[PDB]
Design an enzyme around this catalytic site. Structure first.
Site, PDB file in Angstrom:
ATOM      1  N   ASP A 120       0.826  -1.197   0.000  1.00 42.20           N
ATOM      2  CA  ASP A 120       0.000   0.000   0.000  1.00 42.20           C
ATOM      3  C   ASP A 120       0.868   1.258   0.000  1.00 42.20           C
ATOM      4  O   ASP A 120       1.363   1.669   1.042  1.00 42.20           O
ATOM      5  CB  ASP A 120      -0.914  -0.024   1.234  1.00 42.20           C
ATOM      6  CG  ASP A 120      -1.820   1.185   1.327  1.00 42.20           C
ATOM      7  OD1 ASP A 120      -1.966   1.894   0.318  1.00 42.20           O
ATOM      8  OD2 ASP A 120      -2.411   1.390   2.421  1.00 42.20           O
ATOM      9  N   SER A 151      -0.773  15.626 -12.053  1.00 41.24           N
ATOM     10  CA  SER A 151      -1.020  15.234 -13.426  1.00 41.24           C
ATOM     11  C   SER A 151      -1.269  16.490 -14.240  1.00 41.24           C
ATOM     12  O   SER A 151      -1.794  17.479 -13.735  1.00 41.24           O
ATOM     13  CB  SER A 151      -2.233  14.281 -13.500  1.00 41.24           C
ATOM     14  OG  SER A 151      -2.649  14.048 -14.831  1.00 41.24           O
TER      15      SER A 151
END
Length: 330
Positions: free
Chosen positions: A35, A199
């Site tokens: 994770d 992004s």
């Protein structure tokens, strides 16, 4: 040193991925959920409330000659999905894919929430976010990656998740045969303890690319792709019959649909998520309403590039003094 381990979807939807991890002496092999959105290595154990164990493999520290109680240390964690666990702490030897760390904090669960109990395939979590998020008190502990780092050939790990198939986590090296083209690297902020990046935009299907900054985290422990409501609405508007259902808890679509791809920007590069990756199947057995793999982050408080996004790429988690993230097509 280096390590290399295969990671395998837990079910036919790729809801999560498990990776075998050797703990203790002799080795006790547990299948952990790696994770990158948390920083605790915790396991089902001989100390876990019996009624909360249902099929998991447990770590038994009393059977490990290298286990030592970390006296006074406790831990307690809550995840974004509302699940939780807590317990005490041992140090022991932990190996992943041939890479060994001695003195690793192994957090033994005394209690786990129902979601963990109900998932017989996940024996615990191995956190790969920054150690500043680790919950051990009163002495915060380091992640497996942080402990391994100085011994690694290069201070990196890579995630290469499969679509409906096994993939690979590598530590200490970049496998240049595992991706196509070049890797595009992008800046990371560690201010919130995550692999947080920006992004450069998105496209829906064959549509034009929208240049826009989307801050989010690269999180292997989250199944879906969570993005701003504007972006998500633009995606699902291209699917006939798709809608957001408050009763179901997100966007659903007719199972008869063909889903468009979704593209996200990494610098000037582009990662394409095929439409099939966005299908999470019937909301309930036999239903003709299917659950979407792109969902709104509104009310999470952060955008999350989870497995839906990451499995479309070869992803480099660069833990150099100035960390960065790399993405390549594959």
């Amino acid at each position: 040193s280096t390590g290399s381990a295969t990671t395998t979807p837990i079910d036919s939807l790729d809801d999560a991925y498990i990776t075998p991890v050797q703990i203790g002496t002799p080795a006790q092999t547990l299948n952990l959920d790696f994770d990158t959105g948390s920083s605790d290595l915790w396991v089902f154990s001989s100390e876990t409330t019996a009624s909360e164990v249902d099929g998991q493999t447990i770590y038994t520290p009393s059977k490990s000659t290298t286990a030592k109680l970390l006296s006074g240390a406790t831990w307690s964690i809550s995840y974004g999905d509302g699940s939780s666990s807590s317990g005490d702490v041992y140090t022991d030897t932990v190996s992943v894919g041939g890479l060994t760390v001695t003195g690793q904090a192994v957090e033994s669960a005394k209690k786990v929430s129902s979601s963990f109990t109900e998932d017989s395939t996940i024996d615990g979590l191995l956190g790969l976010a920054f150690s500043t998020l680790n919950t051990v008190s009163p002495t915060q502990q380091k992640t497996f990656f942080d402990n391994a780092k100085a011994s690694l050939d290069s201070p990196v790990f890579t995630a290469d998740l499969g679509y409906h198939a096994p993939g690979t986590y590598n530590f200490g090296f970049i496998d240049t045969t595992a991706y196509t083209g070049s890797i595009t690297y992008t800046a990371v902020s560690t201010k919130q303890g995550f692999w947080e990046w920006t992004s450069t935009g998105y496209a829906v299907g064959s549509g034009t690319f929208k240049s826009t900054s989307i801050d989010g985290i690269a999180d292997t422990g989250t199944t879906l792709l969570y993005l701003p409501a504007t972006v998500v609405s633009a995606y699902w508007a291209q699917v006939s019959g798709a809608k957001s259902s408050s009763s179901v808890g997100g966007y659903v679509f007719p199972c008869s649909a063909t889903l468009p791809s979704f593209t996200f920007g990494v610098g000037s590069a582009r990662i394409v998520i095929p439409g099939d990756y966005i299908d999470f199947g019937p909301i309930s057995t036999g239903s003709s309403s299917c659950f979407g793999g792109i969902q709104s982050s509104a009310g999470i408080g952060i955008n999350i590039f989870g497995d839906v996004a990451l499995k479309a790429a070869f992803v480099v988690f660069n833990g150099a003094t100035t960390p960065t993230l790399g993405f390549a097509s594959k």
